[PDB]
Design an enzyme around this catalytic site. Structure first.
Site: not given
Ligand SMILES: CO[C@H]1[C@H](O)[C@@H](O)[C@@H](O[C@H]2[C@H](O[C@@H]3CO[C@@H](O)[C@H](O)[C@H]3O)OC[C@@H](O[C@@H]3OC[C@@H](O)[C@H](O)[C@H]3O)[C@@H]2O)O[C@@H]1C(=O)O
Ligand SMILES: [K+]
Ligand SMILES: [Mg+2]
Length: 397
Positions: A233, A374
């Protein structure tokens, strides 16, 4: 619609690797610096000092040599520093061979990547979100708290060293962190407000990764010509920008880096430019705020950042439920960068739309999407290790 990486700012069509490397890459690098990440004001500073503070040859029950290294960014002991953790597979060392390396930043401190009780607890500010932090200080209950993202033993068993640095050594991840940052030290502008084109956290994090690489060059246990720089990320946004600016990195991995990483900004999906700058105003240049709800005016998009890795291998990956990162926009960035990789004889994902889950697609330019939310998982790492095996070993001594 997207700017063409292979058309220069003056309309010149880029048809050869020399024009790409010596004319178009500098153009795109400057555009990302001025309009997105902010300028990196210097590369390697004069007077970097490397201090190995601990060294254990029988770490992880004998599987690894562990080193902890203070990398200081100037000769004066009052210069800012970062703390690097390095596990080296003893099976490789013992053969008198240098190990290739996976290098990436961590979110919550070196002590969180593994339970290994010998790791120095980070003495820096740690965000409130860190698991089991107390008062923004590291506790021993935080040890190994982020180990799920870090399958160290598997990486070592596959013949790779693991190197990491806490991102907050370089810039604490809070909107006021730049004033307690590497940027604050290098900022000689006595003034208060950072300039519009001045770097933020992502540029500072990326610079730290290149300084880690500087250290790995000097370490006799590892081969710094075979370093895979990776991030998850926001730290994968940093890994992409580090890999694009610093072509010494052998291989670059973006694990779900999303907006301002691998995802196309001009595709208005999930996180947008206005959303990321509002919530994380320290991450980018203030100049990037010009493009809040004005993505059509962006002179670049993230496919051109991906293209700055060519011809070095690049892996971009997504998670199926991670709409905020815009998996389709991450894939379409890969596809729009592919012509630059193809210029160098490399191949990208076969086909035109997102591959099925857990079916990586591509040559040196590779993509996968995995099931689930995620994160950075054992499945991602399995695919990354196979990629590194192909590009850092295949026809190699
Ligand atoms: C992609 O990298 C970054 C993003 O750029 C960031 O925006 C941030 O994304 C995460 C999102 O963050 C929130 C956005 O809404 C704001 O109001 C809020 O202040 C931010 O904290 O939070 C959700 C998160 O997805 C969760 O991730 C874990 C997974 O298990 C859950 O299912 C998801 O909902 C998303 O990443 O941070 C990203 C980063 O990880 O660096
Ligand atoms: K070395
Ligand atoms: Mg988006």
């Amino acid at each position: 619609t997207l700017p063409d990486p292979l058309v220069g700012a003056d309309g010149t069509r880029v048809h050869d690797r020399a024009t790409w490397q010596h004319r178009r890459r500098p153009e795109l690098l400057q555009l990302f610096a001025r309009e997105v990440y902010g300028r990196t004001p210097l590369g390697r500073p004069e007077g970097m000092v490397f201090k190995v503070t601990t060294m254990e040859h029988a770490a992880l029950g004998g599987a690894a040599t562990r080193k902890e290294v203070t990398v200081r960014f100037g000769r004066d002991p009052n210069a800012p520093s970062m703390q690097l953790l390095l596990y080296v597979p003893n099976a490789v060392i013992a053969r008198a061979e240098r190990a290739p390396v996976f290098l990436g930043l961590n979110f919550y401190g070196n002590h969180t990547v593994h339970t290994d009780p010998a790791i120095a607890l980070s003495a820096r500010w740690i965000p409130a979100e860190a698991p089991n932090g107390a008062n923004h200080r590291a506790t021993e209950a935080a040890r190994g708290s982020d180990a799920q993202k870090w399958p160290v033993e598997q990486i070592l068993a596959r013949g790779y060293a693991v190197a990491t640095v806490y991102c907050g050594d370089l810039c604490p991840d809070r909107p006021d962190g730049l004033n307690a940052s590497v940027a604050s030290w290098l900022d000689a502008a006595a003034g208060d407000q950072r300039a519009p084109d001045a770097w933020g956290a992502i540029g500072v994090w990326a610079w730290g990764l290149s300084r880690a690489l500087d250290y790995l060059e000097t370490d006799p246990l590892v081969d710094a010509s075979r370093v895979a720089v990776h991030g998850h990320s926001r730290l994968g946004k940093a890994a992409l920008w580090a890999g694009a600016q610093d072509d010494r990195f052998a291989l670059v991995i973006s694990n779900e880096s999303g907006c301002g990483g691998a995802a196309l900004s001009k595709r208005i999906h999930g996180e947008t430019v206005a959303r990321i700058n509002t919530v994380f105003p320290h991450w980018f240049a203030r100049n990037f705020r010009r493009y809040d709800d004005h993505e059509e005016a962006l002179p670049v998009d993230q496919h051109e950042l991906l293209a700055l890795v060519a011809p070095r291998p690049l892996y971009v990956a997504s998670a199926e439920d991670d709409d905020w990162a815009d998996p389709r926009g991450e894939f379409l960035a890969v596809k729009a960068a592919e012509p630059v990789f193809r210029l160098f004889g490399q191949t990208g994902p076969s086909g035109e739309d997102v591959p099925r889950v857990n079916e990586p697609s591509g040559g040196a330019l590779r993509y996968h999407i995995r099931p689930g939310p995620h994160g950075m998982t054992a499945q991602d790492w399995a695919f990354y290790l196979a990629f590194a095996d192909e590009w850092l070993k295949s026809a190699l001594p």
